[PDB]
Amino acid sequence: RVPLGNANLIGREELQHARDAVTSAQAQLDVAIQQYNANQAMILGTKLE
Amino acid sequence: LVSVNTTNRDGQVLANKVRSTPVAVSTAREISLAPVNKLIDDIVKANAG
């Protein structure tokens, strides 16, 4: 969507929404990654015994 | 065979003095906790990542 806005062929609210969507997706990914890391704190990559 | 003198009898029959020094102090069997503290630090460091 960015190039259309560069030439002023879409509303600026459309660019704001897309950028905010990218940021929100990044935050959700961070939440998932930290959850997984929290789970891995109880194993520390050691054998079963 | 004990022979106790009694020529001088300036009266003092019951002990009436205190002292701020113990008798028969024994310190052996008191353990120093340094090596176990080193072991605890080693264990805690190994499980933090």
Side-chain angles (χ1 to χ4, degrees), chain A residues 4-48:
Chain A
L4 290 175
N6 282 329
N8 199 271
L9 293 174
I10 64 174
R12 310 197 293 271
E13 194 180 3
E14 281 51 72
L15 282 180
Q16 289 293 351
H17 286 352
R19 190 179 55 81
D20 301 330
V22 171
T23 309
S24 174
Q26 175 55 293
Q28 294 281 336
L29 179 58
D30 282 68
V31 174
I33 288 173
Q34 285 303 149
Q35 192 173 4
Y36 162 80
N37 276 336
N39 184 16
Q40 262 280 316
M42 303 291 289
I43 306 299
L44 299 182
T46 57
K47 299 188 294 300
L48 188 59

Side-chain angles (χ1 to χ4, degrees), chain B residues 6-44:
Chain B
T6 40
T7 306
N8 180 321
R9 43 175 59 85
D10 296 359
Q12 187 59 20
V13 192
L14 293 177
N16 64 338
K17 178 170 62 57
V18 295
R19 58 168 176 270
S20 180
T21 301
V23 178
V25 185
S26 183
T27 176
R29 304 199 170 195
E30 282 190 342
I31 299 294
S32 62
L33 302 177
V36 60
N37 296 342
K38 177 175 182 180
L39 284 179
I40 288 174
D41 195 328
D42 196 332
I43 285 172
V44 171

